[PDB]
Amino acid sequence: IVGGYTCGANTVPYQVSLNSGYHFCGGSLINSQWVVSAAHCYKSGIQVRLGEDNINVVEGNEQFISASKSIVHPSYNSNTLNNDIMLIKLKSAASLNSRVASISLPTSCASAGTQCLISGWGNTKSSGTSYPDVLKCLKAPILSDSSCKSAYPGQITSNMFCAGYLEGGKDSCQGDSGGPVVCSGKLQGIVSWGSGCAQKNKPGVYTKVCNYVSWIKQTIASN
Ligand SMILES: NC(=[NH2+])c1ccc2[nH]c(-c3cccc(-c4ccccc4)c3[O-])cc2c1
Ligand SMILES: [Ca+2]
Ligand SMILES: [Cl-]
């Protein structure tokens, strides 16, 4: 997260770190046995780490659970990143409490102007790499479709939305992919891509979760 602030330990209880010997992507807990992340964060050997703040120090509250299976959306396109969503089923259910809690899926999509909270352990520099130990937060608004399409002509599908600041300075970045974009207590987006990080007129692009709720529900119900 570039231009964000330190969240404060366990203030984002649905945030998870996907780990394979190092942190490579974020994710969101939506119930005690399932996590939602981005399809491009897929790999084998994923250990989901819940209740984290400093990802390099065991401080207490952490729950490390292995993924039993990861379900990449069948229509995921790695060249356009259209349908960049994945569901991860945990080997055992997590113990939910005040430090580990799930986030609700939306019933409707959000409107431009909605203020959301994006979090993650990704890079905090736009020009260079500086990875933090603790979780960073950023409050950012969803942009209108015209501004998004005007910024990325020909690359935005109906399953994506832009959120951020056109002046530059604040954005999600590498290491944040797969993580949550929460607005009014509902998970509206998943960190997907962007051109650089925090550059002027190049806002971040997120997977529009409201378009996948029936898919998530049906897939979980059958797995
Ligand atoms: N400007 C943004 N808002 C933004 C958001 C998420 C991002 N993720 C990345 C990213 C960069 C390099 C590699 C990966 C990557 C690739 C495979 C698996 C996991 C992460 C990224 O997610 C850049 C990147 C940029
Ligand atoms: Ca830790
Ligand atoms: Cl267009």
84 included as an active-site residue: yes
Clarify whether residues 28 and 46 are in a common domain: yes
Do residues 97 and 60 share a domain? yes
| One domain, residues 109 and 139 | yes
Query: Who's near 214: CB < 8 A, 6+ residues apart?
Result: none
The domain total for the chain is: 2
Please enumerate, as own/partner, the contacts of 209-212 that have beta carbons within 8 Å and a separation of 24 or more: 209/36, 209/85, 209/105, 209/106, 210/106, 210/108, 210/109, 210/110, 211/109, 211/158, 211/159, 212/73, 212/85, 212/159
Is the alpha carbon torsion for 6, 11, 14, 20 positive or negative? Answer: positive
**Residue located nearest, by CA, to atom 23 of ligand 1:** 174
**By alpha-carbon position, which residue is closest to atom 18 of ligand 1?**
41
Task: Report DSSP state, residue 82.
Answer: B
* Domain span holding position 42: 13-102+211-223
Strand order in the sheet with 5-6: 5-6, 136-141, 115-120, 180-183, 186-193, 204-208, 160-163
5 and 108 both lie in a single domain:
yes
15-to-80, 128, 131, 154 alpha-carbon distances in Å = 26, 25, 17, 32
Does the C-beta of 168 come closer than 6 Å to ligand 1? no
For position 156, which CATH number holds?
A: 2.40.10.10
Task: Say yes or no: CB of residue 84 within 6 Å of ligand 1.
Answer: no
| Chain position carrying tokens 């994506």 | 160
Check if 126 has its Cβ closer than 6 Å to any atom of ligand 1. no
177 is catalytic: yes
